[PDB]
Every structure is written in C-alpha cells, then in structure tokens.
Amino acid sequence: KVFERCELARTLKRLGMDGYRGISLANWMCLAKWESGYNTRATNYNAGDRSTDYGIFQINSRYWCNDGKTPGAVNACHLSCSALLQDNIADAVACAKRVVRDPQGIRAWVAWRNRCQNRDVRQYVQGCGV
C-alpha cells in the first residue's frame, strides 16, 4: 500500500517510533518519504552488490533480512525480506528499530543523510495529530 502522510505518522506513533533511540517521528517520516514514497511494496535491486532493498524503509538484504539470494548475507532482523513487503508495517518497524540499535543509528540510510539530516523536517508531521 501507499500510505497517506498523516495516516503513516499516526501509524508509526502507535508502533512506538516517536523518539525511538532519539529519533523524532518527523525523521522517520522523512526517511520513509525519500526511501519509498511511503510505499510498502517497493523493491530495488542493487546490481552492484547483488542485494535488494525492501519496503517502506528500503531495508537491505545484505545485513537485515533474508531473501536467500544475497551472497554472504546475514539477517539481523531475523525476518524473511517478504515480511517487509506487507501492508501492515509492524515487522518493518521492528526491523527499523533493530537497524538503529547499531552505532550509526539513522545514518545507516544514505537517503536520510542526503534528504533529512541537518534540515527542517517539521513539515512531514504538520497537522497529523502526532
């Protein structure tokens, strides 16, 4: 599914993302916007390294989920990458929380550094009741 902005914001808040390991909801919104356009079914193959990015946060198969087809990969979220292509984003959120338990935190996603870091991101949550 493709979430509407405010629907997603409330969805993430219910799932405990607001301020998780220091990360405001608006930072998670900005991440989702630029990774996927709020689209849970998005996949992107990285021909360079044979990995794939899955779902609303575009979580990578090399480290985070298992797709069977990525050489040398591990699965720190202990999920099938399929779980990151559900309309229900609970598993994706659990996996995003796992990512940011690692030292880089949200810096793990380059798109965040590019499109969100050091920016005014207040617009993402404006009006949403969150």
Q: Which residues are catalytic?
A: 35, 53
Closest CB to Cl ion among residues 42, 83: 83
Identify residues 88-127 at the interface with Cl ion (CB under 5 A).
Answer: 88
What's the closest the beta carbon of residue 79 comes to Cl ion, in angstroms? Answer: 4
| CA-to-CA separations, 69 to 10, 51, 108, 109, in angstroms, rounded | 34, 8, 22, 22
Does 30 sit near Cl ion (CB under 5 A)? no
Closest CB to Cl ion among residues 48, 53: 53
* Distance (Å, whole) CA 43 – CA 45: 7
97 token code pair = 């929380």
- Among 11, 39, 75, 86, the residue binding Cl ion under the rule CB under 5 A is 86
Residue 72 exposed, middle or buried by CB count within 10 Å (0-12, 13-18, 19+): exposed
Does 39 sit near Cl ion (CB under 5 A)? no
Size of the site for Cl ion (CB under 5 A): 6
**What 8-state DSSP symbol labels residue 37?**
S
Segment interacting with Cl ion (CB under 5 A) among 2-10, 11-19, 47-55, 80-88: 80-88
Residues in CB range of 37: below 8 A, 6 or more apart = 2
Residue ranges that bind Cl ion, judged by CB under 5 A:
79-80, 83, 86-88
